[PDB]
Write a protein that binds this ligand. Structure first.
Ligand SMILES: Nc1ccn([C@@H]2O[C@H](CO)[C@@H](O)[C@H]2O)c(=O)n1
Ligand SMILES: Nc1ccn([C@@H]2O[C@H](CO)[C@@H](O)[C@H]2O)c(=O)n1
Ligand SMILES: Nc1ccnc(=O)[nH]1
Ligand SMILES: Nc1ccnc(=O)[nH]1
Ligand SMILES: Nc1ccnc(=O)[nH]1
Ligand SMILES: Nc1ccnc(=O)[nH]1
Ligand SMILES: Nc1ccnc(=O)[nH]1
Ligand SMILES: Nc1ccnc(=O)[nH]1
Ligand code: NA
Ligand code: NA
Ligand code: NA
Lengths: 251, 251, 251, 251, 248, 253
């Protein structure tokens, strides 16, 4: 039946139980076109939905928009339509000097600097991926030839103060986040992004399998600008990797 | 000089210091066309940006996407480029029996059931609108002929469990939100939505003027299903009202 | 049916549904005498209660004492006796450099640095005034010829550490409140006082109408202890304004 | 030289290092007259201040008003003027069946259901009396012929919902306090009052010696209405006890 | 009825309603031998359990191990077997300059820097001793000749970062605990240890009588081996005398 | 290599270059683990800390008990880290709360619900109590290779045995508000089991540049009212320690 936001039915999905969920609606077609018979299903707000086939099995590709709230809607509605496995892909910036542009990160757990995760489980609950998904993502990332980092991701409800950026309109960062970047660095946290805490917490507490993989396209600690070719290659590699991770998850 | 997500420059805005900020990218052109000389500026992710003119003054119309996190990026980046006043328009679900479909709500304060608000101010800080904006929204709303409610809005990082919906994949609501709708009802809360706590807290703690006005499209307490015609006219009235409220702020 | 603390009955109030609620018991008579036929009703502990007539309608004046706890008792017991509208008048310390001694502040929202507000609503709930009362207070204040500020007030359970005063017995401030004044200043908070968070949260969550107006007796950017000379003039103008605000609230 | 709220100087105190601090301004003279050479010093707001002499030594008697906020002001200002020891006497509602109206309670620790305590120490810090003061209070109470109980007191910023009273304007108790009376009862808590958490935390964290002694005026488990005669004797005995406790504290 | 961890039955305790609870299993025999007819009952994990007689009445000595979690098990299981009064003894480091080695501290309340206390009562609840026990410990400590301090103890789930120790593997202390020693010092807190918040909160909220006494052996702000052994010997002599005062 | 740590009573030289530790709870289990490896030698015993050294495939390995709970565990981990240990393999017993898990099964923790206090002494509550991925992987492989039934998932890690695991057959029969209904809540959220050390261990290590993981044998299932069998508990513990030694083998190469 037609879910509230996504504008698709269970029949539209052709039995798909796995979704690849990028943030950017414009990335959906690109991911779908790496698979067989890509088909456009719907586009509403930040949700662009395609179906495709991978080794003869139906897979959904659905954008999430930025942030846990829009992500939580996409995940819930896809689950209502029979999806059980969710593969998050994106590109990210690193906060460790040893992590290079072109490297890939597979999240083993997220720092819950969001609000939506608390709508599924109290803060004590760990924002952790399904072990099978994380294993598949590591395997796919490594098999691509990239240097892969397994570790903790800080997942923030903001791009600016929650990631301790001072180059802003006010130049102010609330007490909670003052000195926070150095704290996460010292604790070995690899990167910031904005959706994994919500995704991982929601899925781990709701009987759904989820994981996160990302290509590194910038490093907060490095002054040097990466060249255009490296950015293109990394974005291309990240989606090739998520599709092969999906291959490894299919039964 | 070009902001990171919105893809616009200060020059693109032609001196605009006021923005109207709907959730849905598709609503941006619809708002802009109610004003003079609407021009498309940019579209990236959930962010569609137009400029227009109201009584000879430049105004920006920019979508936010769903939720506090994506909203916080749009507000920050517009503020970087000189925007100081932010008028939120949308549609909403009422939780009070006396609030009917077709009515308008102007938020006097938000229950902070989000995460991004905490990235700007600790929980004790009030999610409140600028008084001039709330005043102008009330006046514009009344002048349109619709019945207007001033009151508190519950602002949730989720559509489902944070609004205590049980017709879901798991059918569960975390302890925090069990019984929460009845709690807000008894406290006189008017409605649920998903962006105001973030918007109002961010602006009120950052020297920005903000307010929220919404048309009522559903009522959680009423079993009767509203007419298609009511929905249409409420949507049109919502954006007429927000443009008139903008006019009052510019005078 | 005599209420436990205030020592008055419903009959004593002569049909009054509106109360003016200053902090100081010795201030009650002065306010009542600005109106017609003032009548002493009772005095117990910090609660002195008078009745008077304003444009022919009965009005109650009742002191609250200092702080949310004593305020909460007065409001509850008045509400039991049929009072629905509460107008708070008081003194305050400005934390913005541009706000002058003698200026008036009308609170649009309070930072909840109290404990009693939490006995009525969780911290997420906004300490927000009734829109009609805030409108009436602004109008009364501006019409008087005063310089008036609308904005956020920090409402503290203490006069000393919670308002980051250092000229004290210990000269220490607990970690939570170290740097807090500068934080509130950067967030655009106008002033400090000690009852608004309790009053506004209690009322907004209980179907009662409330607002707060305050005369500035000190600017904290330059001084800690208010001086008694400028206090008398500011207080006299504050009570004229609250009386006019009551006039605007009568049906 | 003159403290802002209390309106007294260090010289006014004639070297007093100990204060007896009742809640009700009208109780101040009654306590002072049990000692030698009682002299009225000042009355401002809820603060009535007397000096007297006990075994040759100067003692201050100062009312606090209801609640932690007003109490914290009196304690601070008296400490500025050399007072180091604070003996609280007051009324209380017992919540255990075995505690009778007329009995006395000496608080060994307080459940911090207040806000002002947090302005001196984080919630982890114990709201505990000075051991010498608690010891002197127990001895004084026993020596008067009262039945005395040592134990934990629940200290609330409200009289009504924080003490789980439902006979109120709304008839509602916020989630936090629903079922709270039974919880404290099962935890062995003896009584409710409204000042001890603030007093004990502030003093224990500030190098001041404090304790609390109270007469039971009602039992929340008993339907029997207290005898007028017993309540009168109870009030009389409480103040005789606190004075003898002061005697024991002085050299 | 054999309890899950302690390996003893109600009969093993011979009617004891009072327990002395040191942290170190090796101190259990030492305490028991200060009394009459000491008898080994059981040793499992960090729990070594003896019985003895004091003025004709049975008393249990049972170690707790380090920390609130292991303490909470010992207390619960002893309470299932009829124990109602719990006397905690140990040695401790002071954080106030005026507190000297050889002095005794009797805890009047604990700063709850633990997690187990929250399993019995919310944070607002005071980690406070039973007044009779605290009174008996003060009396015994003073009667011994020691200088005694009645005051607040900071009770931490860690030895290292929660006591703001920087001489560690990482040299890092989490934000929460940065500057915390100075804060407790300025608030008049006497000392750090690791079990009192759990013990006191659990007992005060469960109808059990508890208190804590400790000998000062070092000072974080400022000792002879002869004085140190004397302090340890004195601490357990004091707790046995406090037990004597609690018997009815 | 010559300074003695405060609680454990060992020096760096005593460890013979060991960078990996196996950390059971029970001091009595230390020798039993050490004897599965080569040249086991007793080093020290103080309080709940019994320390042995052994050799695995020619590499020195430390076995050190933790006692019950986050606080005692945190001391052992810190002091071993001071002496050069970088990898920590926890082995223990656990109560399952899912009906599909059987007594005798093995659980490898993928993340812990932080119902402890010591984890907060290393990182704020938002930080995930997560194992090192290599350790969790080696534990899964070791457990599968022993023929055991293995479950990967979330563990609730409690500072108490009784109220924090929602047990009511206690002295008071009371459970504080926070924990009322909590076992059903974790059950519905897919949590596998209760134990008492993983939240502290995993948070401390993940935030301190140390590698850690947890494997446990199921001794009780809360959904099955069976009185623990003696022969079964012994069999479960023997298998558990075989698994953790094989997991260490995998980490050393
Ligand atoms: N700097 C200032 C000045 C005034 N006030 C207000 O006055 C009363 C206590 O003086 C309190 O009731 C409070 O509302 C304050 O809190 N801070
Ligand atoms: N049942 C009761 C009885 C008495 N009290 C104490 O008396 C004052 C409010 O009447 C307050 O100051 C409070 O200390 C109370 O709080 N609850
Ligand atoms: N950035 C942060 C640091 C510490 N605590 C938080 O909640 N957040
Ligand atoms: N630095 C960042 C890059 C991409 N996404 C983020 O959230 N942060
Ligand atoms: N934080 C909360 C959310 C919803 N309901 C509550 O009572 N509290
Ligand atoms: N019920 C609702 C309608 C519209 N928006 C919401 O967030 N919720
Ligand atoms: N410094 C210390 C000495 C003894 N015990 C502690 O916990 N801390
Ligand atoms: N049920 C349990 C068995 C073993 N350990 C625990 O902590 N809990
Ligand atoms: Na979005
Ligand atoms: Na008062
Ligand atoms: Na232990």
């Amino acid at each position: 039946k037609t879910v509230f936001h996504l504008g698709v039915t269970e029949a539209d999905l052709n039995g798909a139980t796995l979704a690849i969920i990028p943030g950017d609606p414009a990335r959906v077609q690109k991911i779908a076109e790496l698979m067989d018979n890509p088909v456009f299903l719907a586009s509403h707000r930040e949700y662009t939905v395609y179906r495709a086939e991978l080794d003869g099995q139906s897979v959904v590709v659905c954008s999430t928009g930025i942030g846990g709230p829009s992500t939580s809607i996409a995940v819930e509605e896809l689950a209502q339509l029979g999806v059980r496995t969710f593969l998050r892909v994106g590109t990210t910036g690193a906060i460790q000097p040893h992590v290079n542009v072109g490297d890939m990160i597979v999240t083993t757990g997220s720092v819950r600097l969001d609000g939506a995760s608390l709508h599924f489980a109290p803060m004590e609950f760990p924002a952790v991926p399904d072990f099978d998904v994380a294993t598949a993502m590591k395997a796919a990332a490594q098999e691509s030839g990239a240097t892969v980092h397994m570790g903790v991701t800080a997942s923030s409800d903001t791009f600016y103060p929650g990631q301790e950026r001072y180059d802003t309109f006010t130049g102010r960062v609330v007490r909670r986040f003052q000195g926070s970047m150095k704290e996460w660095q010292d604790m070995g946290v690899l990167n910031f992004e904005m959706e994994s805490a919500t995704l991982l917490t929601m899925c781990a507490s709701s009987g759904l399998k989820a994981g996160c993989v990302a290509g590194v396209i910038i490093n907060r600690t490095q002054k040097e600008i990466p060249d255009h070719a490296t950015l293109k290659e990394t974005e291309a590699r990240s989606i090739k990797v998520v599709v092969e991770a999906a291959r490894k998850m299919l039964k």
